[PDB]
Design a protein around this ligand. Structure first.
Ligand SMILES: CO[C@H]1O[C@H](CO)[C@@H](O)[C@H](O[C@H]2O[C@H](CO)[C@@H](O)[C@H](O)[C@@H]2O[C@@H]2O[C@H](CO)[C@@H](O)[C@H](O)[C@H]2NC(C)=O)[C@@H]1O
Ligand SMILES: CO[C@H]1O[C@H](CO)[C@@H](O)[C@H](O[C@H]2O[C@H](CO)[C@@H](O)[C@H](O)[C@@H]2O[C@@H]2O[C@H](CO)[C@@H](O)[C@H](O)[C@H]2NC(C)=O)[C@@H]1O
Ligand SMILES: [Ca+2]
Ligand SMILES: [Ca+2]
Ligand SMILES: [Mn+2]
Ligand SMILES: [Mn+2]
Lengths: 240, 240
């Protein structure tokens, strides 16, 4: 289809169109990307992702069209630790994408350690909300919590300073305009605090014509829950 | 998801979200539900159907919600003869539905011969565009071409006389309003000729909470092509 749209105001336990990978699962009408014990407390060494089952037609070589898409979602992070890790990401990848071996911790379940910074060995666009930046392990990160745009590498092509707020929902709108090739990110907390970051990228040179979209999160030595609360997505092929 | 929508202005050959059953296949940016020969002419004894891969949440028992839905599509029928058969139908059925054994000809690939008229043995709602009504084989049909609403039986609960026009596209709009429980069908040719038929039905007592939607077509000893040219669908769970 040239256009596809779906909306999850909440996530009831009865799901049919979500692909669950790793430890991801539904609890209390929300998606818990990373594992939690019986008490609902976060635990270390966990990775989880979800993808919508239907494939998205991102662009079409035969007609020179590229999709205009929007992804709106909200999530919250919680941890008893002073440095909860590692973060959550909205991503776009080839339909057959699976969790790479050893992609936990700072790799967010998106990259393998051996090629995490080799832009030639990956095919993924992701918007990350990174809460762990120890300069000793996450050597690629700026020294502060941040929102980042990742294009084939865990070393973001761009980041902006972000404030982690325990237990508070962050609302995010990610949009891509094929005319300007601008990928825009706007995130806000309920008190009006706003974060914005934009990057120009030709998706045709990074991803295949058909892709799958979803979320990924992970915790290494440090942990926190990564709870996806809602998600709506829409894409339509346009002439350029 | 509470809401889902998709649109196929045309049908390019590289489809990823369609389930093809029987003889259905893509040819000339359109879906040819029934088999044709090397030169594009319809052949006898053929059945074919397509279903969208993503499941639709038609109703939810927990929240007591029922979805409204709208399906818009266009198709054309062509045959060397004039007594083309057997027809095409838009249908909604359980997710695991498959072509019943011996469901060709007048059963449109939707029902099995032994239980075609047993409402307690089927789970399907369909809107049929029936072009063959010979009483020797299609004993359940009115004696003329027609559009009918089928609920668990090949014997339509409601029909309206219709005119088959070789090679001309018919634009169809099917709508279900959960508030009134009315399933409305509006079909029109480009010259404005309009056909309407509606019926009140409680989908909750006929279909499961999750379903798949698609089209089915068949030809028995008489034949014609059943070409699906475009299709858009949208559904949203609502509180009535
Ligand atoms: C206290 O933890 C810090 O210090 C120790 C020791 O120096 C590091 O080992 C820690 O690094 C691990 O944990 C952080 C925080 O969760 C992650 O950001 C790091 O990535 C790292 O986690 C490992 O990451 C690799 C990939 O680089 C994974 O393959 C591996 O599975 C992860 N380990 C675990 C136990 O999950 C931190 O700086
Ligand atoms: C000339 O054809 C008409 O008269 C003969 C002789 O009585 C019937 O056999 C024909 O019936 C078959 O063809 C029509 C038109 O295509 C269908 O509408 C009928 O359903 C029938 O086709 C068979 O239908 C059964 C289901 O009831 C299928 O199991 C069977 O496969 C179909 N036959 C074929 C060859 O496909 C018609 O009245
Ligand atoms: Ca990090
Ligand atoms: Ca008939
Ligand atoms: Mn980072
Ligand atoms: Mn009929």
């Amino acid at each position: 289809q040239d256009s596809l749209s779906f909306g999850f105001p909440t996530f009831p336990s009865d799901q049919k169109n979500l692909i669950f990978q790793g430890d991801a699962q539904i609890k209390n009408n929300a998606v818990q990307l990373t594992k939690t014990d019986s008490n609902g407390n976060p635990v270390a060494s966990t990775v989880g992702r979800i993808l919508f089952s239907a494939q998205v037609h991102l662009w079409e070589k035969s007609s020179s069209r590229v999709a205009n898409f929007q992804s709106q979602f909200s999530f919250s992070l919680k941890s008893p630790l002073s440095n909860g890790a590692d973060g959550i990401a909205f991503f776009i990848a080839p339909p057959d994408t699976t969790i790479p071996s050893g992609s936990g911790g700072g790799l967010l379940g998106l990259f393998a350690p051996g090629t995490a910074q080799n832009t030639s060995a990956n095919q993924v666009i992701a918007v990350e909300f990174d809460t762990f930046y120890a300069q000793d392990s996450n050597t690629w990160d700026p020294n502060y919590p941040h929102i980042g745009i990742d294009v084939n590498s865990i070393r973001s092509v761009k980041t902006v300073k972000w404030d982690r707020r325990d237990g508070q929902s962050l609302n995010v709108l990610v949009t891509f305009n094929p005319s300007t090739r601008n990928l825009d990110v706007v995130a806000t907390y309920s008190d009006g605090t706003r974060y914005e970051v934009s990057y120009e990228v030709d998706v045709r040179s990074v991803l295949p014509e058909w892709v799958r979209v979803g979320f990924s999160a992970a915790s290494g030595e440090q942990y926190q829950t990564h709870t996806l609360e809602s998600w709506s997505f829409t894409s339509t092929l346009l002439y350029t």
